[PDB]
Enzyme design. Structure first.
Site, PDB file in Angstrom:
ATOM      1  N   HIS A  97       0.858  -1.216   0.000  1.00 21.43           N
ATOM      2  CA  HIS A  97       0.000   0.000   0.000  1.00 21.43           C
ATOM      3  C   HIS A  97       0.884   1.252   0.000  1.00 21.43           C
ATOM      4  CE1 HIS A  97       0.025  -0.377   4.581  1.00 21.43           C
ATOM      5  NE2 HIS A  97       0.510   0.842   4.331  1.00 21.43           N
TER       6      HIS A  97
ATOM      7  N   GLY B 214       2.588   6.043   9.715  1.00 21.35           N
ATOM      8  CA  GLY B 214       4.012   5.945   9.346  1.00 21.35           C
ATOM      9  C   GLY B 214       4.714   4.753   9.978  1.00 21.35           C
TER      10      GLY B 214
ATOM     11  N   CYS C 126       3.732   1.688   9.533  1.00 23.27           N
ATOM     12  CA  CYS C 126       3.571   0.557   8.577  1.00 23.27           C
ATOM     13  C   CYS C 126       4.966   0.170   8.061  1.00 23.27           C
ATOM     14  CB  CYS C 126       2.564   0.900   7.482  1.00 23.27           C
ATOM     15  SG  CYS C 126       0.888   0.552   8.094  1.00 23.27           S
TER      16      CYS C 126
END
Ligand SMILES: *CC(=O)N1CCO[C@@H](c2ccc(F)cc2)C1
Ligand SMILES: *CC(=O)N1CCO[C@@H](c2ccc(F)cc2)C1
Lengths: 304, 304
Positions: free
Chosen positions: A41, A143, A145
């Protein structure tokens, strides 16, 4: 003595954390050898997140659209592929701090350490479990991830988790390092509900052993039970069923304390049925389930 | 979202951990620049530990009696001195992984991370507080002595603790990195009792803020209080007194949540007087006091 919720030393994983930027989206990647692993993503606008077709979105991206930064030095991307929900970015430089590693897919109840990172920099380390509903209860802001979960066996980092998602309830979902989600979750901004968050019974038992080992004995009762009788009370309290495999695994703690596993089961049964009555075990007012039998043995024997 | 008991990434401190051996005694040292810091009882037989005269015991020791090993390479000791309860071993090699660092003496209530080590190798990392009785509730087996507590401000490790001792109750005592014990403890195998282990009130308040920030709001009441009224209830519950300095420090959490500090105080007051009634706050059944206001802000804003 004393018993602490303890993470692995994070140094070996700190040396792998990079920043990955695609367009306006920045998150963390894991640089192992000449490959950077990150959540796919990274290619998405939060407009894309509503119903992304990752294969279609990926056509629009080249090697040079993926900006990979390790400290304040850019890595050259010479290759990119999608594996399930992760991107593998081939870079022209092997990570010189690559530790010995494995990718492992852990079972529910298994514990691991998270190195929470932002812009490829580590902010903190904590200990987690894969919940029986295949969520984790993490600490993860925007952030975070690409932050990873791991165990260390001496010098070998087993990477078991990559952070991808916060569910509307504020519990966390992510993938193994082959990009396959734990549980039925998808990388899409669509309402997804977790199943029943059951207590990891074998992990509670381990921690009751750790308690006895460290002098907290007030809860040891005069009763025993059977797996079937214990499991009727477990089911009633949203505790996971206990198998002979769980009993097997607890054997070493059974040996060291001279408390038969089924006796400790009967003590747990009374703690469920009577509650703590305002008392604590290892400075907790509820029964802890994020220590595995292996964790308890490791911390009680000082493995490095 | 989510809120975890979170240690600093340990990598910068892993790169400082060495094994120190004097005669038969092996524990951990901290190698910073060309100096190795370790507990002075490294020179003691457990016979010596009963009534050691460290100055007298030290006369019998030379540079070459201190065996310092970093990984599987021996460092040459060219100098040794005693500062309070630590030994500073001058070695002929500056630690090439020396991070930017400070030695700081922390106040009771201050939190820090411990890298628990054995034979100079890290086994795990956890988050602690200096208790108001100047003990810590650690996880430390034999050989853990020399393990250190630290905070990190960006790239600067502030070393605040070195492990020395387990009291007969299984709580822990140690020194700052100038070798001065926290509290009235001495490095001697003599019964030493901790004072009252009070709850760190300002840290509970911080954590009630973290709870609200993360959606756990059930305990927010319709009451306010005064510092004096609050403190009468605090004293009664072995909570530390709350000062205007504690209120000041909570201001940023007050601002972000729109809950006045004294309102949160009144909520805590009711939680003391009514208990949790079987409920939990951030997955705890008791009020957590090992997060500082700074910790809550750091984790709630994702500082690296
Ligand atoms: C975890 C993280 O850093 N982020 C920021 C970018 O993506 C966010 C996101 C993930 C999945 C999803 F369905 C929507 C948004 C989370
Ligand atoms: C902490 C640790 O490794 N040890 C082993 C050697 O010394 C032990 C000790 C310290 C203080 C004391 F008064 C007696 C024994 C602890």
């Amino acid at each position: 003595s004393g018993f602490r919720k303890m993470a692995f030393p994070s140094g070996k994983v700190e040396g792998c954390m990079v920043q990955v930027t695609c367009g306006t989206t920045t998150l963390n990647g894991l640089w192992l050898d000449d490959v950077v692993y990150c959540p796919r993503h990274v290619i998405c606008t939060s407009e894309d997140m509503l119903n992304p077709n990752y294969e279609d979105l990926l056509i629009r991206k080249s090697n040079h659209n993926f900006l990979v930064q390790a400290g304040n030095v850019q890595l050259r991307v010479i290759g990119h592929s999608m594996q399930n929900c992760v991107l593998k970015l081939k870079v022209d430089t092997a990570n010189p701090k690559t530790p010995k590693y494995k990718f492992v897919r852990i079972q529910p109840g298994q514990t691991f350490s998270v190195l929470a990172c932002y812009n490829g920099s580590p902010s903190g380390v904590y200990q987690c479990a894969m919940r029986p509903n295949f969520t984790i209860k993490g600490s993860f802001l925007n952030g975070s991830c690409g932050s990873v979960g791991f165990n260390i066996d001496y010098d070998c980092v087993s990477f078991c988790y990559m952070h991808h998602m916060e569910l509307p309830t504020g519990v966390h979902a992510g993938t193994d390092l082959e990009g396959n989600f734990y549980g039925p979750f998808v990388d899409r901004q669509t309402a997804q509900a977790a199943g029943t968050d059951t207590t990891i019974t074998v992990n509670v038992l381990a921690w009751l052993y750790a308690a006895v080992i460290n002098g907290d004995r007030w809860f040891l009762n005069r009763f025993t039970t059977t797996l079937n009788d214990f499991n009727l009370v477990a089911m009633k309290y949203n505790y996971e069923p206990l198998t002979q495999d769980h009993v097997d695994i607890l054997g070493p703690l059974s040996a060291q304390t001279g408390i038969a596993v089924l006796d400790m089961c009967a003590s747990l049964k009374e703690l469920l049925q009577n509650g703590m009555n305002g008392r604590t075990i290892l400075g907790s007012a509820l029964l802890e389930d994020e220590f595995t039998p292996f964790d308890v043995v490791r911390q009680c024997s000082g493995v490095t």
